Amino acid sequence: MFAGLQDLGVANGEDLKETLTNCTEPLKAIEQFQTENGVLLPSLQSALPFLDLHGTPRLEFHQSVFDELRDKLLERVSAIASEGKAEERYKKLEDLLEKSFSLVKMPSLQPVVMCVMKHLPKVPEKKLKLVMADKELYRACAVEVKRQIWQDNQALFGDEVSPLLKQYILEKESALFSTELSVLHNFFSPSPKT
Amino acid sequence: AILKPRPLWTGKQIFSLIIPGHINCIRTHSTHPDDEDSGPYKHISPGDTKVVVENGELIMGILCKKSLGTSAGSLVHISYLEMGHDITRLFYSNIQ
């Protein structure tokens, strides 16, 4: 649930529990962790008093800030993918994706990684090999990412295609063995286009 | 209509006694300036056009063939449609 945060140096709940298990005073440690390495702005720490005293806990706007900064980052990366020089923006998105595959295991930030990976028209080999090993990560991939997956994975592409062919055969057999027997509508009646 | 300094009746006041029943009609005089309605004084015409009849009373306006002749929606037509034919006959006789 909260895996992959440790790679970038931003400790997750696992190391939090590890540190507070052998800690005697949680108050000062939690205050410094939410203050020192937190948002390094006097605005947020100074806003904590008013938002506390309103009765609405600070968790609410903290989560809202996280989600809206996520959305703004995603939309701006989408814009950058369609602004400026193609190679430069693609290299910047490659760097961002390489530094986001550390957090790819975070469902609250999995949309970030997946959208940025969609933003790359050609994902490098190793990251694709990593994502295709997991069911949900494979299934959330964009159309370009799935195209990259199938371009060099014959057996998996065939496995994906096979159920569609099965549905086609089932529909064709049901039409061929249709109870409604008439010349007005038959197997060969519909146009090739439809 | 005018009590002091001396009693005086108006032509419209007397004519309202001729119009039968309670008849409502709005017409326009032949010499009505077409640009008066748009501007101010639409409901108070300086030239006394815009014939208006309410409850069988000639409130304002000057009668001409546009309101007394053989035109659709004229005063005699409204009298015929609203009232009977006998009352309209009395109207025709009384006017003359």
Partner: protein, 145 residues
């Protein structure tokens, strides 16, 4: 735009409703949903009649010849009953809607019940019914008469 803003009879603006209807009527037309649905259906029939008219009468000719003079009848009623069109009125719009609906049935040109006669009767009074609905509206009966 003008047609909608002149025939819609919005039932959400409470302050506007205050000037036209009494309290016991504005609360009824604001709370009940059956009334709102009926009035919206009335406006839909309004638009359908407009569509029919625009192919019946191309070239945009409004003048038409019809039996009864609705505007003059409304004026006569106003002068008879001393309406004083300044105060709110005790006219529930649903009364207007269902009164028009009932009145339409009473004006018969082709009498019968089989589908042929019903269709002929519907055609023979189509223009008069359209005009009658278009004047005896719910908004016009509350904002203009």
């Amino acid at each position: 735009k003008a047609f909608e803003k002149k025939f819609r009879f919005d039932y959400t603006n409470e302050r506007a409703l205050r000037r036209t209807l009494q309290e016991d009527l504005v609360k009824d037309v604001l709370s009940n949903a059956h009334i709102q649905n009926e009035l919206e259906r009335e406006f839909e029939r309004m638009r359908e009649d407009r569509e029919v008219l625009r192919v019946i009468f191309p070239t945009g000719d409004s003048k038409v010849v019809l039996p009864c003079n609705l505007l003059r009848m409304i004026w006569n009623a106003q002068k008879i009953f001393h309406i004083n069109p300044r105060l709110p009125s005790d006219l529930h719009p649903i009364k207007v809607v269902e009164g028009v609906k009932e009145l339409s049935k009473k004006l018969v040109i082709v009498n019968g019940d089989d589908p042929l006669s019903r269709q002929a009767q519907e055609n023979a009074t189509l223009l008069f019914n359209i005009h009658l609905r278009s004047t005896l509206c719910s908004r016009r009966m509350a904002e203009e008469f």
